[PDB]
Amino acid sequence: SMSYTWTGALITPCAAEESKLPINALSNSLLRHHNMVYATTSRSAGQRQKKVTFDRLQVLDDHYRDVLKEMKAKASTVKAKLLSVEEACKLTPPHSAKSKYGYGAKDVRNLSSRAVNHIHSVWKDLLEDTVTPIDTTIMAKNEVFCVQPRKPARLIVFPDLGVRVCEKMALYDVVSTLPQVVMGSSYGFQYSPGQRVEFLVNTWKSKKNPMGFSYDTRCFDSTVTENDIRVEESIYQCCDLAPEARQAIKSLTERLYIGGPLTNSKGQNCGYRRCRASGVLTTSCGNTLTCYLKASAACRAAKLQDCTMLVNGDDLVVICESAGTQEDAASLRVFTEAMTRYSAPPGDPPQPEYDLELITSCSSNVSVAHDASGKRVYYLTRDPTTPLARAAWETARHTPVNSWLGNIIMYAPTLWARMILMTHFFSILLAQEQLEKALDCQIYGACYSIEPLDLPQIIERLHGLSAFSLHSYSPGEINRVASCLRKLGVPPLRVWRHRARSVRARLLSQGGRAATCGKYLFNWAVKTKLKLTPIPGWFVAGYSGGDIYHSL
Ligand SMILES: CNC(=O)c1c(-c2ccc(F)cc2)oc2cc(N(Cc3ccc(B(O)O)c(F)c3)S(C)(=O)=O)c(C3CC3)cc12
Ligand SMILES: CNC(=O)c1c(-c2ccc(F)cc2)oc2cc(N(Cc3ccc(B(O)O)c(F)c3)S(C)(=O)=O)c(C3CC3)cc12
Structure with a gap:
């Protein structure tokens, strides 16, 4: 069976698409080699279509069935609840794609009757109908990279906003709790x-x-394959579930998860999917x-x-x-x-x-550094090329997700995150007085609204207090960072060390939570170190493409 079948209608864009790195007065301070950075657009969708379109053969032996039986036995101990409409609505991001039926993400979050009413009828239809394929939109993703000796856009496939809310109702508790029990x-x-x-x-x-x-x-x-998606359903069905939830899960499996028609942004039929949709719960x-x-x-x-x-x-x-x-x-x-x-x-x-x-x-590897006591500390890092390219984009353009913020949180102990990302953006935030302004970012696929001033407390909790005092990084890690900086034409680390002193001093001058950011985030920048004492639901599951949002 072929993963996709295509009609020949193009994958079209919804908004305008830029491929060239935007430049403003802040750009050169971060990255000089502008022509190395690019964003993917729908122009490359044809190339990606060829990559993702192939035949699947599957041969299943006893080892496979023995493991499935064991996984089913653990899943049988899980009790999952149905979310209410209101609960599911509150999990919707504010900038989630609007419905084709005259309401958007902000209407859903508000519990407006038009949104709530459509949601009820979609839910009823799922309970009554277990056969009719559900429509999906196929779009090209706009993502920023560095050239390497260009990548075609990735594809996202997602159903209407009303269906996505119904997915949350039936499955949010399941996908949040089942994985850890089974695995x-x-x-x-x-x-x-x-x-x-x-x-x-x-x-x-x-x-x-x-x-x-x-x-x-x-x-x-x-x-x-279809087999994989049915087997996946059989695992969910082992759970102790509300009857509505069982039916809705079966319905979404038959009608959405297994496959369905693909429609472009301009409403034309692109073809048919028989593999995983990237943009469902x-x-x-x-x-x-x-x-x-x-x-x-x-x-x-x-x-x-x-x-x-x-x-x-x-x-x-x-x-x-x-x-x-x-x-x-x-x-x-x-x-x-x-x-x-x-x-x-x-x-x-x-x-x-x-x-x-x-x-x-x-894309990550484990590496070693030392804390203030001199004891070895292990941490995860990666090649900083893509984060830096995206940082450069976001320096000149406001985007939906702030990758710089995500990278600071997820890679806070790294040399490059601390010396470059923290220094560069806190300087931008200071100049605009936007330290207290909440920003959207993605952690494990889920969208979070976070105020930059809360980074010290967040970082402490995810990495420990040692993330603010690591030094003596590996020669291999140092060389990889320095090499990347030369490649992209980013100023060398010694320049960032100088800039960090200024940013720290500015942070301290303002007192309060800002001074706390200066003390903890930039303690690496000064010789006379300030003694770092402690400061007075984020990781349950992954939700990539799952239209999930949380605040605070
Ligand atoms: C099976 N592989 C692993 O579990 C991981 C190893 C690993 C490396 C070497 C090795 F020998 C063994 C394991 O490194 C990791 C680093 C990350 N991060 C980066 C990161 C990668 C992607 C996303 B994304 O898609 O959403 C993201 F949000 C953050 S993070 C925040 O630092 O923990 C992750 C996160 C959960 C996805 C997993 C692993
Ligand atoms: C100790 N306090 C300082 O300010 C630091 C001085 C320094 C030395 C002499 C001097 F006169 C002024 C400053 O060098 C440091 C080196 C590092 N590292 C990273 C690193 C920073 C810059 C370059 B650079 O472009 O040459 C580099 F190659 C590697 S490291 C070896 O891995 O621990 C650190 C890490 C963040 C904690 C701090 C300092």
């Missing part, structure tokens, strides 16, 4: 970055002769379960010993007991063959690693 410590989204590092390190140490590898499936969403939970099922079964087929898996979305790492270097390489070949039989072939073949730091997953 235990292997469900990646339960961890803060700090807890994640601690788990990777403790897992690595729990093995006598440790071996680990990342496994990255080629275009995962397209690899997901179950996208993250479905992918994680499916990746866990296939991967756990693959481990057994390859006879890997004492496996510990870590899964979030389509991203996967396994840490296990080495059988010897030659025997490990053979077992990974078998692992890959099984995953391929299950329809999930790798992009690049997996490689066994015998140091935790040589494993790359979710």
